[PDB]
Ligand binder design. Structure first.
Ligand SMILES: [Mg+2]
Ligand SMILES: [Mg+2]
Lengths: 177, 177
């Protein structure tokens, strides 16, 4: 995968902690019924994309083949999301206390940078696209990520412990995405 | 010019105020003689690049031809630097008090964005490149700029009223640059 994304190396620049990320806010559900809001019941406007996803491990972002942007890699596995890929055995989890698990050379990280390629094919109803705004919410991604929707680059996010949100309204189509 | 530079539009993103810019610091001259430092005499290690530069005006960054990176544009004039290009008559200076001179739509600016293409051919001695670090210092560039050296992209800067500095050690060659 290329070109601006690999050349710009946003994950080695503390001046770039996000690209195209929406403003942070308190928890939303966008109820269209007041009584459902009052009683804190599920909202039709808030969908979980949790469940079975496609996943492939790579030793570095340079190793990621371009075709992955367009379609599923045959060598990928089907895995549960949310998950830490170390818990599925793709590489080792590391326990260190104080000493960084990487060479201390800010803002640089090792060239061998384990890379998790997650993908999902899913439906979007036309009602969601005729009007209004459809965003995706990643509550936790460790430690940084680039996002594509239907082959098009959407954005980038950092901070493993807060939600990253991106407007997908111009990226989605009715049916399979 | 292209591809990552025009695609990223760093001049319409308050999250990117510089790329590859060096840390700010008090005025340096790197004297190699202490008596010279004491008397505040000129330093052979601090060279002015003020004087005659080549300049061309464009209505937008998109209209800048790729060739300008590699070689001088025949249509470019020879102008004095430092200068404001309005004072040379290339476009009009604007006096507004409170109301912004552009449509208030942060972080966006008009697609018609007057662009000043400056170039300089200059000598660097081998003594400068065999040892140590050679930086360029721009004390004031209004309002934002990309920098190339011998065709290769160096970095980007904002804030019109403070110096932007860049390491050219790896971009320069002995003789003409
Ligand atoms: Mg970064
Ligand atoms: Mg900017």
């Amino acid at each position: 995968i290329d070109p601006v994304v690999l050349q710009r190396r946003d994950w080695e620049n503390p001046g770039v902690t996000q690209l195209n990320r929406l403003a942070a806010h308190p928890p939303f559900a966008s109820w269209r019924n007041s009584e459902e809001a009052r009683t804190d019941r599920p909202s039709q406007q808030l969908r979980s994309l949790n469940g079975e996803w496609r996943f492939a491990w790579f030793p570095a972002p340079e190793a990621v083949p371009e075709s992955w942007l367009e379609c599923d890699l045959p060598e990928a596995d089907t895995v549960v999301v949310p998950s830490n890929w170390q818990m599925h055995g793709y590489d080792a989890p590391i326990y260190t206390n104080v000493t960084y698990p990487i060479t201390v050379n800010p803002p640089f990280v090792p060239t061998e940078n384990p890379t998790g390629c997650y993908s999902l094919t899913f439906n979007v109803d036309e009602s969601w696209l005729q009007e209004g705004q459809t965003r995706i919410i990643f509550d936790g991604v460790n430690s940084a990520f680039h996002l594509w929707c239907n082959g098009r680059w959407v954005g980038y996010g950092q901070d493993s412990r807060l939600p990253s949100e991106f407007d997908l309204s111009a990226f989605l189509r009715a049916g399979e995405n």
